[PDB]
From a paper:
Itaconate, which is an unsaturated dicarboxylic acid produced by the decarboxylation of cis-aconitate, is an intermediate metabolite in the tricarboxylic acid cycle and is a striking example of a small metabolite that regulates enzyme activity for cell growth and survival. Initial studies of itaconate production in fungi indicate that the decarboxylation of cis-aconitate to generate itaconate was catalyzed by a ~ 55 kDa protein, which was called cis-aconitate decarboxylase (CAD). In mammals, high amounts of itaconate are produced by macrophages activated by lipopolysaccharide, which is a major pathogen-associated molecular pattern in gram-negative bacteria. Our structural investigation of IRG1 from B. subtilis (bsIRG1) shows that bsIRG1 exhibits the typical fold of the MmgE/PrpD family containing two distinct domains, a helical domain and a lid domain.
The 1.78 Å crystal structure of full-length bsIRG1 was elucidated by using the molecular replacement (MR) method. There were two molecules in the asymmetric unit, chains A and B, both constructed from residues 3 to 445. The structure of bsIRG1 revealed that it consisted of two distinct domains, a helical domain and a lid domain. As the calculated molecular weight of the monomeric full-length bsIRG1 (residues 1 to 445), including the C-terminal His-tag, was 47.7 kDa, the peak generated by the dimer indicated that the working stoichiometry of bsIRG1 is that of a dimer in solution. Unexpectedly, unknown electron density was detected on the side opposite to the active site, between the helical domain and the lid domain, and was assigned to 3-cyclohexyl-1-propylsulfonic acid (CXS) by a ligand identification tool. The main forces involved in CXS binding to bsIRG1 were hydrogen bonds formed between the sulfonic acid moiety of CXS and Y269, R283, and L339 of bsIRG1, and hydrophobic interactions formed between the cyclohexyl group of CXS and the hydrophobic pocket formed by F93, L408, and L419 of bsIRG1. Based on the structural comparison of bsIRG1 with IDS epimerase, mIRG1, and hIRG1, we noticed that bsIRG1 was an open form, whose two loops (A1 and A2) were localized to expose the active site. Structural comparison showed that A1 and A2 loops are flexible and control substrate accessibility by working as a gate. An in silico docking simulation of cis-aconitate and bsIRG1 indicated that C1 and C6 carboxylate groups of cis-aconitate form an extensive network of hydrogen bonds with D91, H102, K200, K266, and C271 from bsIRG1, while C5 carboxylate forms hydrogen bonds only with H151 from bsIRG1. In hIRG1, Y318 performed the role of Y146 of bsIRG1 by interacting with the C6 carboxylate of the substrate.
Numbering used by the authors:
A (entry chain B), B (entry chain A): 4 to 448
The structure:
């Protein structure tokens, strides 16, 4: 009669992710996307606030701060590197997680790898994603609806499990590490729209790393924190659901492959990517523009735009969650790029165009079987001068599983910030599973 | 201020605790009890596990680790000193908090006072207790019953508010710090019976200190984390209750005075202190002993022993939550002292005596008007040869508000560990509000 805590600890401990060629390939691509997203945010001012904070605390310079040209202590690095990866909303997402797995897991593993077992990082990454996906599937819808932020609340446990795999924790050590992570698990969706939201990823990475370090120190703790009427799932979610779903069909195929990580080509809310692809198609094929369009209708399935909470953004940052701003920015001839999603105010011409973009809801159109997320689509319809219309539909955006990034796409995202030579050195280190060389290259200056 | 977050921030910011002579006296006594509890646990092996961890991380030696003879970084010191204060269950309790306020608040304030504003520490301590008491009152009974550990889940916000008062944060900065603390709030009762339970106090102190440092760094965050249907009280407790109770009659009377901190004379669960007082009375006045007692009946009102979850402890640590062990230990002629509540096994003779002690429940006996906690009493009845019985009743144990420690009790608790001359110098520094000298003394080199 094995409880959920022991069940998860055993599944993690005895995993053999390196036996899956596809999962290893996907983990290498994940390291490259994580690096690209972190580099693209290297000038974000929140990073400097956090660097001044940890410099005031002090710490041994052991782990690189990605893209920042310095090192810091392991737990400090986990906080910093999680924030950096998530700061621009340019990092990866996972449909099971309903959140951002690599921004939590990879910082924890970077801190572990800088200090041993780096030969297990890729496998640990696969296992970490496996846990976070399954936690997201198991916790229940009410968890997010009530106000918890999955990236934070499930990230600490997933990071503890990834690092626990990497460091070859015993069954008892891993059970305790899971409980040490669960008893720190936190993060509130009220922080959305502020830089505390990406900081949740760093604090979750830090909490999971601390959980492993406590277990390795022989610190005492519960071995059954998932179990019972006061266990983690009863407290934060749906324990019946977790009992049915958490461990079923563990591993191959790994969740990092199926349903798979989605690597973003746009630095804004994944829920706007369909519209972004569609309007770009219309601008390319039909030469539409803000000047020649009277107005726009954006068609979602009911609830498809729930994450796009900004209908009248004033800032590029607020515009990250506005399908109106995404479409209007493209119609005005601008790239859907990092520089246009900052705290600077949206110019008045684009705001005028935003006022001519409306959302409508279509409960009859059947989503495509390969849609990401499942059941999602978006149609963009432009109204031109003489009553003419044109439309484009996207169900699986570029970068999502089923519409994967090309070789060249990965290189392009990496070279947003660094020369071609740097990006190629990074790619080669990752291809060779040379984690020491990877870590050396991603520090930058 | 309008809304709960702004309201609490304003209540904290504009507090004038220094106008309350009684509150200042109580805060000084709380500092001395915190110090004595921390000193008494200085040999705890968990402390060395945590010291090795933070030494591996590194940090500037800025803040004393109480009783350990070294300094560490502010956030590290908060973690260490909260653990140290709570490690033996010898630290203070508060009925509104349903938890251990000083083990959270004083570590955060020590880290803040070591870097300035030390003249505000005593006031900040009062304000911190005010917040944690009100959170414990406002969150609702279901919070603890569901499985959350109030010391952990309410401590970060209380510590952020104490340090925010000490460092004179603005209204906006305090609103943000409250949210930075709330979005980290965590801690599960499944960790009871392990040293992770006292570590919750340090992790809460650390999270509250981080919240203040983020607000001071101009880090972005929600200013309304208590408010709305995804706010802290809706997520973790009873938002209706909090709307009625959180801010009402603030600071009048200060909760550190009424109902007041309880300073323990025994290093075990407060709920056993009545029985401890009673059995000692019986041993003193009637010369009962393990040898001449057939059996014991211990009488509680319904629910009075709910916290005493161990009826058949195997170790002194488990014995901390066993009225049977407390009574049996006293009957066998041993002091109710730190050395008898360690992880070492309970000897077979004491276990035999434990088997002769039964709990019974009396719903008719009226608690005394001065009972602490409200409605609580304990009667100890000893059955001797020839059918004789003797009984002793305790309603307000020594150390509880209304039956406060003498000066001599305070010095005795301090000298469990250090010579009388050292303790007198510590007390003198606290009496004069010489916080710098106090901080110098409690490092123990």
């Amino acid at each position: 009669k094995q409880g959920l805590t022991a069940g998860l600890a055993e599944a993690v401990r005895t995993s053999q992710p390196e036996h899956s060629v596809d999962a290893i390939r996907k983990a290498k691509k994940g390291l490259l996307d994580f690096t690209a997203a972190s580099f693209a945010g290297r000038e974000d001012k929140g990073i400097q606030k956090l660097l001044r904070l940890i410099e005031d605390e002090g710490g041994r310079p052991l782990v690189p701060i990605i893209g920042q040209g310095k090192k810091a202590a392991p737990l400090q690095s986990a906080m910093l590197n999680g924030f950096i990866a998530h700061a621009l909303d340019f990092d990866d997402v996972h449909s099971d997680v309903r959140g951002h797995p690599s921004a939590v897991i990879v910082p924890a593993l970077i801190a572990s790898a800088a200090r041993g077992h780096d030969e297990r990082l890729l496998g640990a990454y696969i296992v970490g994603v496996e846990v976070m996906a399954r936690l997201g599937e198991s916790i229940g819808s009410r968890h997010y609806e009530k106000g918890w932020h999955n990236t934070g609340t499930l990230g600490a446990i997933a990071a503890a499990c990834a690092v626990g795999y990497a460091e070859e924790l015993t069954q008892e050590e891993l059970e305790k590490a899971i409980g040490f992570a669960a008893t720190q698990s936190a993060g509130m969706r009220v922080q959305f729209g502020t830089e505390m939201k990406p900081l949740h990823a760093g604090l979750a990475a830090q909490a999971g790393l601390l959980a492993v370090k406590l277990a390795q120190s022989e610190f005492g703790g519960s071995r059954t924190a998932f179990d019972g009427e006061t266990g983690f799932f009863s407290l934060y979610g749906d324990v019946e659901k977790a009992q049915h779903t958490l461990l079923n069909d563990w591993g191959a195929p790994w969740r990092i492959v199926q349903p798979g990580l989605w690597f973003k080509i746009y630095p804004f809310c994944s829920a706007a990517h369909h519209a972004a692809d569609a309007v770009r198609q219309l601008i390319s094929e039909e030469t539409i523009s803000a000047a020649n369009t009277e107005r726009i209708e954006v068609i979602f399935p009911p609830g498809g735009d729930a994450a796009l909470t900004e209908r009248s953004p004033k800032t590029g940052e607020e515009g990250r969650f506005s399908v109106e701003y995404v479409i209007a920015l493209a119609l005005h001839g601008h790239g859907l790029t990092v520089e246009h999603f900052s705290s600077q105010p949206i110019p008045n011409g684009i705001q005028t165009t935003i006022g001519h973009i409306q959302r409508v809801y279509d409960n009859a159109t059947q989503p495509a079987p390969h849609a990401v997320p499942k059941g999602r689509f978006t149609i963009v319809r432009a109204y031109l001068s003489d009553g003419r219309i044109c439309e484009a539909r996207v169900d699986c955006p570029k970068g999502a599983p089923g519409n994967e990034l090309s070789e060249e796409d990965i290189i392009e995202k990496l070279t947003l910030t660094v020369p071609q030579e740097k990006a190629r050195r990074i790619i080669t280190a990752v291809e060779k599973a040379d984690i020491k060389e990877f870590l050396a290259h991603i520090e930058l200056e």
